[PDB]
Amino acid sequence: TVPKLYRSVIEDVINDVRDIFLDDGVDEQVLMELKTLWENKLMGQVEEEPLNSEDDVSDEEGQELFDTENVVVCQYDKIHRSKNKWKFHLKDGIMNLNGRDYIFSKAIGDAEW
Amino acid sequence: AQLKFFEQLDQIEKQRKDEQEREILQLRLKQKAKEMQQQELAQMRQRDANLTALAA
Amino acid sequence: SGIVPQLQNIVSTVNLGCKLDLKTIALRARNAEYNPKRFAAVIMRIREPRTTALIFSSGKMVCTGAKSEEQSRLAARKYARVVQKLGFPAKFLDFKIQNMVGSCDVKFPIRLEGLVLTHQQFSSYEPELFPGLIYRMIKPRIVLLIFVSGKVVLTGAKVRAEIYEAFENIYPILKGFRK
Amino acid sequence: MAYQLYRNTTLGNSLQESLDELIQSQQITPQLALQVLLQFDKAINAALAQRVRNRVNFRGSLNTYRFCDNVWTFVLNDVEFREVTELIKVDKVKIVACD
Amino acid sequence: LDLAGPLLAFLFRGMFKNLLKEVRIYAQKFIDRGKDFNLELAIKTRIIS
Amino acid sequence: TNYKPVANHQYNIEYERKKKEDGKRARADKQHVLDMLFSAFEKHQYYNLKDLVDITKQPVVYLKEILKEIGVQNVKGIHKNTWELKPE
Amino acid sequence: FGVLAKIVNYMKTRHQRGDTHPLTLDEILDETQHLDIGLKQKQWLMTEALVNNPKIEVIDGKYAFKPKYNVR
Amino acid sequence: FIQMSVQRIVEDAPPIDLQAPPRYLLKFEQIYLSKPTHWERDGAPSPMMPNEARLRNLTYSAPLYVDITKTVIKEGEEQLQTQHQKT
């Protein structure tokens, strides 16, 4: 299923880049070579100014630096929050969970902070 | 390379032979006007890509 | 009277004494959000004090949601420290409690009609606009929302003493209109 | 001239690596590579918008969130992606959203 | 002989021309602002009355 | 049935919803605003401030400041005094 | 041509730096994130047309000294 | 006058055309006239007898209502037609 969608995307991409390859004057063999390599690669403190009186008031910032864990990239239509919970109308997008990819149109989410 | 120069002269006629139709007649002008509109949105649309790559 | 109002929310403003980059703070902060189209400030939230703070490019910040004065001050200091950790020279200048909100219950229904008739000079009861009667106390500059269920909410106080004094003043009046 | 969201995914990474190989081989110019990336972004956006007709659900807890330039960067933990056909469990997830 | 009818008809034609004139003006202002207009608010009854 | 009591007119609530959804125009960076202005001047030699505001999608005051920095107001004998996007 | 007026604005900010030195077009195009191809050639035709009316002075050799009145 | 001329004048009045893009068309179709009525200060309508009008210095007048059809063409290939009865 997902591989079939990928093949359709390949067809769309090549068709969309043909015109640019003609505009820039480059030969068409580049597209064939690109597709071949792409497929192969895929498969009392009165003086309060000092703030040092408190320490370890944060968390590890390395999660955003790593980004190695599963990542979901999509578009959002509505996102509401009522004092505890975050609600998500995320529309069509892509998800990368455990390497395997997932495709969706409507995504509904509820989370707690 | 000499043949590429000849092809460039032919691309100029595409527009230049067309240019004679302009003044005598506006589709090309409309297309040009549309192109500018695409560029305006692009820059805004593009801004998101650089920051999203930094975010993820 | 035997009843003491309990604070539900405190608003406090403090100047950091340095200009800031709202976009940078939004990008680097943990819980911060920045929507210049919607609002010109940056809205951040900290769960442990359980409060929300708005930070402006001018260096002034507003902290709300704190249930106590100490909690408000600590939350403001925490927000300032977060901004400082983001590399800015944030400080803690002229921290002040701009407004305090308290709530309580008188444990008996109230006749807002009689209350407004007696204290028309300070009372405003418009069921069409708001079911709660609005009372504007003068000696304390406190606004009280009195409800038929007995719940009373005081607002506009700068110190807890004003909240308690306003409730002490209003309780004898309400007792005279017990339903 | 496009959102470029999917560049930092498996598909975009593979395309970028292929373009890097051709650039190393001098077969394609960097301007051509950038144009290919732009066209890919347009095509992928259209394809996901049109050929996807399935709904998904998920629940969990949120540990962090960020917003700037209409870009959400939520960070959830212990998420359960529930679908009528299958259920998936994940310890942590980062949801990047744009519009 | 112009009796009550024709005389009142002349007056009413004039006043109805007026009524439509203010209706046009009021609706035109809202349309220029881009917001729809309320027909009931557009009508001035005092004109005819 | 005429003039039935209503909390708010349907047109008014629709317009308010549109305004709230659109949101106020944001003050973008000087570099991007300048680039957009220069792109617009390429399409048209002369621009009125009202339409230039729509093109740029920036606050009127901020756009006027940036435009005062470079462009200059020329008085015309045909319609009115309008901005000129050419710095000189 | 619009990018050209943008280069003019760039060299104006360069004057504002006060470190104005004899330059050329390639370094400006690089620092302004733009390339060097036949596009630079057509825009350089436009740029020489500019050199025919460069009230903002853009001379070919040692140049860029815009201000008709300039001492410090 | 009441039966023929008022209705004919309303009919002959040209339809109102507005545009400044969506365009609105207002057409006045039918005339309705109720019995002479007087409104008390409380706003309650009540029939007004001529003797009452004479005594109270009122005007013996009858409310006048028109049926108005407003059709809006949004240029989106759909036109919305709404009829206000007895405005």
From Swiss-Prot, chain A:
Task: List residues modified as Phosphoserine.
Answer: 53, 58
Post-translation changes: The alpha and beta subunits are postranslationally produced from the precursor form by TASP1. The cleavage promotes proteasomal degradation.
Q: Per its UniProt record, what Gene3D superfamilies does this chain match?
A: 1.10.287.100, Transcription factor IIA (TFIIA), beta-barrel domain
Keywords noted in UniProt: Acetylation, Nucleus, Phosphoprotein, Transcription, Transcription regulation
The impact of changing residue 58 to A is: Strongly reduces phosphorylation. Eliminates phosphorylation
Q: Name one GO biological process term.
A: transcription by RNA polymerase II
Its GO CC terms are: cytosol; nucleoplasm; nucleus; transcription factor TFIIA complex; transcription factor TFIID complex; transcription preinitiation complex
Specify whether Metal-binding is a keyword of the entry: no
What is its subcellular localisation? Nucleus
What GO molecular function annotation could you give as one example from this UniProt entry? RNA polymerase II general transcription initiation factor binding
What InterPro entries does the entry give?
A: TFIIA_asu/bsu, TFIIA_b-brl
Indicate which residues the UniProt annotation says bind DNA. 80-81
Role of this protein: TFIIA is a component of the transcription machinery of RNA polymerase II and plays an important role in transcriptional activation. TFIIA in a complex with TBP mediates transcriptional activity.
Per the similarity annotation, which family is this? Answer: Belongs to the TFIIA subunit 1 family.
Please identify the protein, giving its name as recorded: Transcription initiation factor IIA subunit 1
Which organism's genome codes for this protein? Homo sapiens (Human)
Q: In the UniProt record, what gene is named as encoding this protein?
A: GTF2A1
From Swiss-Prot, chain B:
Localisation per UniProt entry:
Nucleus
Full-protein residues shown: 942 to 1011 of 1085
- Superkingdom, taxonomy of origin: Eukaryota
Q: Which residues form a coiled coil?
A: none
Q: Which disease?
A: Intellectual developmental disorder, autosomal dominant 73: An autosomal dominant disorder characterized by intellectual disability ranging from mild to severe, developmental delay, speech delay, behavioral abnormalities, and non-specific dysmorphic facial features.
Name by which UniProt lists this protein: Transcription initiation factor TFIID subunit 4
Functional summary from the UniProt entry: The TFIID basal transcription factor complex plays a major role in the initiation of RNA polymerase II (Pol II)-dependent transcription. TFIID recognizes and binds promoters with or without a TATA box via its subunit TBP, a TATA-box-binding protein, and promotes assembly of the pre-initiation complex (PIC). The TFIID complex consists of TBP and TBP-associated factors (TAFs), including TAF1, TAF2, TAF3, TAF4, TAF5, TAF6, TAF7, TAF8, TAF9, TAF10, TAF11, TAF12 and TAF13.
> What is stated as this protein's family in its record?
Belongs to the TAF4 family.
From Swiss-Prot, chain D:
Q: What is its main location?
A: nucleus
**One GO MF term:** protein heterodimerization activity
The entry's cellular-component GO terms read:
cytosol; nucleoplasm; nucleus; transcription factor TFIIA complex; transcription factor TFIID complex
* CDD domains for this protein: TFIIA_gamma_C, TFIIA_gamma_N
Report keywords, A-Z.
Host-virus interaction, Nucleus, Transcription, Transcription regulation
Record localization = Nucleus
Q: Which domain of life is it from?
A: Eukaryota
Keyword check for Nucleus? yes
Q: Give the SUPFAM superfamilies listed for this entry.
A: Transcription factor IIA (TFIIA), alpha-helical domain, Transcription factor IIA (TFIIA), beta-barrel domain
What is one process in the GO biological process aspect for this record? positive regulation of transcription initiation by RNA polymerase II
* UniProt KW Transcription keyword: yes
To which protein family does this belong?
Belongs to the TFIIA subunit 2 family.
* Summary of subunit composition and partner proteins: TFIIA is a heterodimer of the large unprocessed subunit 1 and a small subunit gamma. It was originally believed to be a heterotrimer of an alpha (p35), a beta (p19) and a gamma subunit (p12). Interacts with NCOA6 general coactivator. TFIIA forms a complex with TBP. Interacts with HSF1 (via transactivation domain).
Role description: TFIIA is a component of the transcription machinery of RNA polymerase II and plays an important role in transcriptional activation. TFIIA in a complex with TBP mediates transcriptional activity.
| Name of the protein this chain belongs to | Transcription initiation factor IIA subunit 2
Q: Which organism is it from?
A: Homo sapiens (Human)
Curated annotation (Swiss-Prot), chain F:
For this protein, what is any one GO molecular function term? DNA binding
**Do the record's keywords include Amino-acid biosynthesis?**
no
The residues that the entry says bind DNA are 77, 79
UniProt keyword annotations, A-Z: Acetylation, DNA-binding, Nucleus, Phosphoprotein, Transcription, Transcription regulation
The family annotation for this protein states: Belongs to the TFIIF beta subunit family.
Write out the function statement from the record: TFIIF is a general transcription initiation factor that binds to RNA polymerase II and helps to recruit it to the initiation complex in collaboration with TFIIB.
How is the subunit organization of this protein annotated in UniProt? Answer: Heterodimer of an alpha and a beta subunit. Interacts with HTATSF1 and GPBP1. Interacts with URI1. Interacts with GTF2B (via N-terminus); this interaction is inhibited in presence of GTF2F1.
Q: What is this protein called?
A: General transcription factor IIF subunit 2
Organism source for this protein?
A: Homo sapiens (Human)
What gene, per UniProt, encodes this protein?
A: GTF2F2
